[PDB]
C-alpha cells in the first residue's frame, strides 16, 4: 500500500509499505529516497512518535494514511 509521509517542509512523500512492515524499515526506505539519517528521523502518528520496534498495524496505519516526519534540529 502507499502512505503519505509529510515532512517539515510540507513535502508529502509517498512511500510503498505493508501493514506488516516495521517502522525501522520505513525509516530506511525514507533514507533511500531522501538520504536523511534514520537516527534524526522522527515519525509521528496521532500525537505519538512511531517506535522502530513496531509495525504499521500496531499504530493501525491503514492505506493512504498521513504520516509525519520531523527532523530533530538540536543544534542551532
Amino acid at each position: 500500500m502507499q502512505i503519505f509521509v509529510k515532512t517539515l517542509t510540507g513535502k508529502t512523500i509517498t512511500l510503498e509499505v505493508e501493514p506488516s512492515d516495521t517502522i525501522e524499515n520505513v525509516k530506511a526506505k525514507i533514507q533511500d529516497k531522501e538520504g536523511i539519517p534514520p537516527d534524526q528521523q522522527r515519525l509521528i502518528f496521532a500525537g505519538k512518535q512511531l517506535e522502530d520496534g513496531r509495525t504499521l498495524s500496531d499504530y493501525n496505519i491503514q492505506k493512504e494514511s498521513t504520516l509525519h516526519l520531523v527532523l530533530r534540529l538540536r543544534g542551532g
Partner: protein
Amino acid sequence: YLVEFRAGKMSLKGTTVTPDKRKGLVYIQQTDDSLIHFCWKDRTSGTVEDDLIIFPDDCEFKRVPQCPSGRVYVLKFKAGSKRLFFWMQEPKTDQDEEHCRKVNECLNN
C-alpha cells in the same frame, strides 16, 4: 509552562462527545526532548489526565465554527483520526482565538 489556561475537555462516550464538568487547565510543556507535550490537568485534584506528544501538522488545533457557544475548540489529528474537544473556561472571548494561536504556534514549533 509556555501556554497555560483554564479549559474543560470532552470525552467520546461510546459514540457521543460528552463534555467534562471538572475545572481543568490546558498546559503546553515544551521539553528539550523536542516533544511538545500537550497535557490537560485537573485543578480540583491536581491530576494530569491527558499527556500527548504534539508535532507540526500532525495535530491541528482548530475551533469549531458549527457551535453557537463558540468556545468549543478541537485538536484534530491528521493521523489516527483522533479528535479531542475542549471548551474555553475564559470569562471573555477577547483572548479565545489568541490562546488558540499561541497553542498552534507551540504545537508546530
